[PDB]
Amino acid sequence: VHDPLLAITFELTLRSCLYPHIDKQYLDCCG
């Protein structure tokens, strides 16, 4: 998933766009 995310500041704020994907899944799991 993060390999196509690089196309659409590198590995600092860009890497902080990867983390919402594990956050959204985590919310569904715990709820």
Partner: peptide
Amino acid sequence: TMVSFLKPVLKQIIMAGKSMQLLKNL
């Protein structure tokens, strides 16, 4: 023995893994 790279999302890592296993136990 550890890095701090994964720190800003680590809580939601651990708290998802263990809770998913507690789903799997049902």
